[PDB]
Amino acid sequence: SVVEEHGQLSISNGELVNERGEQVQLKGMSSHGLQWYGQFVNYESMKWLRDDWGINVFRAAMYTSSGGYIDDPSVKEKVKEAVEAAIDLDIYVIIDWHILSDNDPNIYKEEAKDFFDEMSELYGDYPNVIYEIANEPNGSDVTWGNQIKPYAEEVIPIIRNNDPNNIIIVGTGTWSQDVHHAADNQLADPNVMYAFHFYAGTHGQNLRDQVDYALDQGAAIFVSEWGTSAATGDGGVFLDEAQVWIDFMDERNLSWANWSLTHKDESSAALMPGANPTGGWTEAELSPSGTFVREKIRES
Numbered sequence: 001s002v003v004e005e006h007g008q009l010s011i012s013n014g015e016l017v018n019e020r021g022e023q024v025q026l027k028g029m030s031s032h033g034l035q036w037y038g039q040f041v042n043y044e045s046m047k048w049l050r051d052d053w054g055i056n057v058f059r060a061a062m063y064t065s066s067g068g069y070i071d072d073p074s075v076k077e078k079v080k081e082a083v084e085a086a087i088d089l090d091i092y093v094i095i096d097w098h099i100l101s102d103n104d105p106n107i108y109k110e111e112a113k114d115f116f117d118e119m120s121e122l123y124g125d126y127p128n129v130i131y132e133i134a135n136e137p138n139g140s141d142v143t144w145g146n147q148i149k150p151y152a153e154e155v156i157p158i159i160r161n162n163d164p165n166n167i168i169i170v171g172t173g174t175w176s177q178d179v180h181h182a183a184d185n186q187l188a189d190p191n192v193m194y195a196f197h198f199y200a201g202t203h204g205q206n207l208r209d210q211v212d213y214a215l216d217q218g219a220a221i222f223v224s225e226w227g228t229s230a231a232t233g234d235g236g237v238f239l240d241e242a243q244v245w246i247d248f249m250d251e252r253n254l255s256w257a258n259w260s261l262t263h264k265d266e267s268s269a270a271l272m273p274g275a276n277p278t279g280g281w282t283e284a285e286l287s288p289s290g291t292f293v294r295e296k297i298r299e300s
């Protein structure tokens, strides 16, 4: 199994490596918001993804706003369920503090510190855990140097007091697209990665060149959210551009999590409406996006 084989992950010269120092690449799925589609996040559905799709990482998208954790903290228990299922299935798991409408990570920074203190105290002695402290910082007034980096410099110390070196993914500006700025002003923690998010509906040649720039500065990049659709999560399925990005990520050995595991009627959703929330999906229960993503992970 994956975690038994690769064990402790770390960053070495800007690259994600296992405990023997070998490069590793994680490929999996992200849940949709846990406050809306939490029924698809359970041991059985995760086991089906592992066994039938070949996933080696699962991302628990805990929205903070929009009816998420700040409005009802009960969703933190669903994150715990996902983490424990990943531990039982021997796969990696990303704990995502999913900011979005609350566009500056500093808005709920005290709550984030308390949440990450609890999560790292509970699960800090497992190698499966990857922390994602701010999904998608966004807005012209939310910059890397003034807002995002200082936020990370307050939250990372909290995690590091309990868990010295599991991987931490830090969001970047402009909905986690501005890896150039983060790469030119990196954080001191040696086991940090910078998030890069893309949607296949957007022509991506310059964005690929921007990721290459960041990689050239020695910044480790995790594609913690990407979709086959347009940036809204809907608007069509763009498989030609998605395949270009898949090939690019393999060439650069970039780890990734696809958005998202839900039956919602939007192009990026991986499942069709009567898909069983506990897995075992037939061909007809997978959407065009989900069919493609499953093929990409099985091929790997």
Ligand SMILES: *[C@H]1O[C@H](CO)[C@@H](O[C@@H]2O[C@H](CO)[C@@H](O[C@@H]3O[C@H](CO)[C@@H](O)[C@H](O)[C@H]3O)[C@H](O)[C@H]2O)[C@H](O)[C@H]1F
Pocket (backbone or CB within 6 Å): 036, 066, 100, 135, 136, 197, 225, 227, 231, 232, 233, 234, 259, 264, 266, 268
């Ligand atoms: C990364 O990008 C994706 C795609 O844009 C984002 O996921 C989308 O987030 C939307 C906003 O949360 C979400 O729409 C919401 O869906 C809810 C559940 O159905 C509705 O109650 C709400 O009205 C609606 O705005 C899209 O369904 C989803 O794909 C992701 O959050 C970003 F990190």
